[PDB]
Design an enzyme around this catalytic site. Sequence first.
Site, PDB file in Angstrom:
ATOM      1  NE  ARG A 238     134.002 -28.622  73.884  1.00 25.09           N
ATOM      2  CZ  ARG A 238     133.784 -28.470  72.581  1.00 25.09           C
ATOM      3  NH1 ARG A 238     132.509 -28.619  72.060  1.00 25.09           N
ATOM      4  NH2 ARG A 238     134.907 -28.087  71.743  1.00 25.09           N
TER       5      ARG A 238
ATOM      6  CD  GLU B 221     120.535 -30.540  57.904  1.00 29.38           C
ATOM      7  OE1 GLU B 221     120.042 -30.726  56.674  1.00 29.38           O
ATOM      8  OE2 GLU B 221     121.419 -29.906  58.415  1.00 29.38           O
TER       9      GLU B 221
END
Lengths: 178, 178
Positions: B69, B106
């Site tokens: 982007r 994570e």
Amino acid sequence: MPIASYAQELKLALHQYPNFPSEGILFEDFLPIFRNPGLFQKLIDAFKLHLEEAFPEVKIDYIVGLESRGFLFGPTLALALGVGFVPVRKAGKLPGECFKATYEKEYGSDLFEIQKNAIPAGSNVIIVDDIIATGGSAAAAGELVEQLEANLLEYNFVMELDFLKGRSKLNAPVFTLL
Amino acid sequence: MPIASYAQELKLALHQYPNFPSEGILFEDFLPIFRNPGLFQKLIDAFKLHLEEAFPEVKIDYIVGLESRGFLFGPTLALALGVGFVPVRKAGKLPGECFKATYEKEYGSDLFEIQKNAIPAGSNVIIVDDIIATGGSAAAAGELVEQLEANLLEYNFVMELDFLKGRSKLNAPVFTLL
């Protein structure tokens, strides 16, 4: 001369990388062009001049750029031409309703999408990308433009490379700058 | 104020999408901006106005955009400023010698790269992207700029979104347009 003069300078700025991204493929990296505004300007001017000469009496509505290399010059070309820019992305990235197209490979497939409301039916567009080789993503982008009921005037590529897998048929004229 | 006018108009062009890319995240799509050259130019003018005020006596050498982007407006902004553009990509895409940086999530990781020869040591850089949320890719890009021995002046983003996973620490000031 003009377009040819720009093409010449840009060609000299490419960096050759043998065996990339796979053994036997002679890759040409166009990224050095963007590192220098003088060169980047010439890349945009070359495509602009080409489109002005190829479609002097035909209105171009959008530049459709393919992820991710087409994003590097497509949006700027669009602005330079005074037209809109719309991306074709790998499936699962774009938000909202999308049209989808599949590119079947030897092993598995590549899925592509374009936002349904991005381009009105009847619009005239140019699909752009860095490299045209096997042509899978380009062909898929073509199918997406058809689903939008838009007209594909031409494909504009920076270069043509041989990825050793042949070429998929493209149903529109093709201009390759270098 | 000019930049206030641009921001308000650009904000109205955004389209909201609940639960995207995942449940609980309220997404804001900036793609409609690129469909309209008038709006697209206002986005560029807004960032130009910010940088002209933020770094009056400091030379900017490169705009570093994050895949993909950041590729939509980063190169355009770079050319408009008359500076170079260099991409940070997901690992395994860029040709040539690259520096690598890891974003530890994570339960996984995202590896990023930047070409070693793309930016000379001592260069001043601005990292740009569309959304700043978790800041994972942004943090990695900062590490890559450090490996180039370049100076990270600031991060420039279009918007800030809440991806429900907190935000990594960035070692440079942050400017978010909308």
